[PDB]
Design a protein around this nucleic acid. Structure first.
Lengths: 471, 50
DNA sequence: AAACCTTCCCATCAGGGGAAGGTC
DNA sequence: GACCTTCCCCTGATGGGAAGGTTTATAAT
């Protein structure tokens, strides 16, 4: 075959299905990966300082209680007051005791109370991005301090990593390589400003993230592994239950939308139903995924069907009206009355006619007209924009008639008329507008205009213009 | 156009806000009216001739 | 398809103020 | 002549509403 629908219809026959084993087997893998990435945040003082600001603002009317947490692994509103002071049992035992020997085995018990508060993915993603931005900030300094010595001073990469691995904090390593007398040593005094001050944005991070420059790398080093596990699992999940999406999508044939469009818009909802699914509840995955798949198909139809896009609500309401008219064909015998569905529906009466009036579909201009000839609809379509030439001639004639007539009046009245009206001039002028540059204002012009319109109202000077009026 | 506005000011001939539809007999044929029907939509009250 | 919810744009309502009117 | 009550135009509120967005749990290939 050729059609790209065949490439897909037989692209899923590769990954075998997954039922009763697959689901619960790889869901555990998903959670085991997110657990690796979750404890990566357990040691991040910036997360504590950021949690305080968004926590106290909840009691000050900015952020909802159930908007920042999905629950605690430990819907009860009373389970809150009991876990806001009992978790600080390790808060101040390791921070002010750096004054850092016994502050190495007392960091796990402080981070343990940080994995019992399930935050909403909205802020959770901000936390993940926070660690990412911290890694990029720390790394910018390394890719600075490195190329300032290797690519410029021509020093071996290994003499750089050997002197850098372990410190990454102070300048004890840079100024110590000056005594090596190597060919690159004599070129280290010039870059002593792009590497010394470089630690101002690198070493300072330590006093912000409360951790050595190297630990900031360890955290993300394992976090990436966890997120990779999660990705590799979810892709297999959707590949396995892919056929279900087609099973659901084949229920929408003539929906103003191609088949593949539907199956794809349904695969999107499949992914969404996957990411928000817990294998713990026991309920099979086929029941849950179907909701998001079928909805991401239905609403998608409501959004890509009509050439004139319509808000979702209207689609729902119109389809309901159609349903009521359908289930009443057998009752009334032929079809319901116009003002009948007004009561059967929750909506009022007079909205039916408008809802049905806008429900028309555009006809392809290529729809062949009667006689079945090659003549199409787009051939009988007129053009009511261009004015016929029979009127353009009248315009070019009135222009000259008005010109001659106005040139028959006085000079003052002439300019006053060509001013109050946009005659042979850009944008006509108001009363005081004319009076502004005609030396007498506000009623002079109001008299001049009436006088001139009266000297033209009189015949023997209006016949020419008067003929242009025919009613 | 301003040239027309000058006319509307001179002879005081205000312009209607309405266009014209006017089912008029096709040019080339002349006949006699033998039947006139009127179909009004439901709800909208009928006119006199209706 | 139904159910609960946030943002925006509407075309309108108490409330303030700058004076305004009328008399014991 | 002041004092009280009255008569109209801006600020900004804020009720109403159309338009969008997120979930929905038996399983459903």
């Amino acid at each position: 075959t050729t059609d790209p629908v065949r490439m897909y219809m037989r692209e899923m026959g590769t990954v075998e299905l997954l039922t009763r084993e697959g689901e619960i087997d790889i869901a555990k893998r998903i959670e085991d990966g997110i657990n690796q990435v979750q404890c990566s945040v357990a040691e991040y003082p910036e997360a504590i300082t950021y949690l305080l600001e968004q926590y106290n603002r909840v009691e000050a009317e900015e952020a909802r209680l159930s908007d920042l947490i999905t629950g605690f692994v430990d819907i009860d509103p009373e389970l809150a007051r009991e876990k806001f002071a009992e978790l600080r049992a390790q808060y101040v035992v390791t921070r002010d005791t750096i004054k850092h020997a016994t502050a190495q085995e007392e960091i796990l018990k402080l981070s343990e109370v940080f994995k019992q508060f399930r935050l909403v993915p909205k802020q959770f993603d901000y936390l993940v991005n926070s660690m990412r931005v911290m890694m990029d900030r720390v790394r910018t300094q390394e890719r600075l301090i490195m190329k300032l010595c290797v690519e410029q001073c021509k020093m071996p990469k290994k003499n750089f990593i050997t002197l850098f691995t372990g410190n990454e904090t102070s300048d004890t390593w840079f100024n110590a390589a000056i005594a090596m007398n190597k060919p690159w040593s004599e070129k280290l005094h010039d870059v002593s400003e792009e590497v010394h001050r470089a630690l101002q944005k690198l070493q300072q991070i330590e006093e912000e993230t409360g951790l050595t420059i190297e630990q900031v790398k360890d955290i993300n080093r394992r976090m990436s592994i966890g997120e990779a596990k999660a990705r590799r699992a979810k892709k297999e999940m959707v590949e396995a239950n892919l056929r279900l999406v087609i099973s659901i999508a084949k229920k929408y044939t003539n929906r103003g939308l191609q088949f593949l469009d539907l199956i794809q818009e349904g695969n999107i909802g499949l992914m969404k139903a996957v990411d928000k699914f817990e294998y713990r509840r026991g309920y099979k995955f086929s029941t849950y995924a179907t909701w998001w798949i079928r909805q991401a198909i239905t609403r998608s139809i409501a959004d890509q069907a009509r050439t004139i896009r319509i808000p979702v609500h209207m689609i729902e309401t119109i389809n309901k009206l159609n349903r009521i008219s359908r289930q009443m064909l057998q009752e009334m015998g032929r079809e319901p009355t116009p003002e009948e569905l007004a009561e059967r529906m929750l909506m009022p009466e007079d909205k039916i006619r408008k809802v049905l009036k806008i429900a028309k579909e555009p006809i392809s201009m290529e729809t062949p007209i009667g006689d079945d000839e090659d003549s199409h609809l787009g051939d009988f379509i007129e053009d009511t924009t261009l004015e016929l030439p029979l009127d353009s001639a009248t315009t070019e004639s009135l222009r000259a008639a008005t010109h001659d007539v106005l040139a028959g009046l006085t000079a003052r009245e002439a300019k006053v008329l060509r001013m109050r009206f946009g005659i042979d001039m850009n944008t006509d002028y108001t009363l005081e507008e004319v009076g502004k540059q005609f030396d007498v204002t506000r009623e002079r012009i109001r008299q001049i205009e009436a006088k001139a319109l009266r000297k033209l109202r009189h015949p023997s000077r209006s016949e020419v213009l008067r003929s242009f009026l025919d009613d | 156009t301003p040239e027309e506005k000058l006319l509307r000011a001179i002879f005081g001939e205000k312009a209607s806000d309405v266009k014209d539809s006017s089912l008029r007999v096709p040019n080339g044929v002349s006949g006699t009216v033998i039947d006139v029907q009127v179909f009004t939509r439901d709800g909208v009250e009928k006119d006199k001739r209706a």
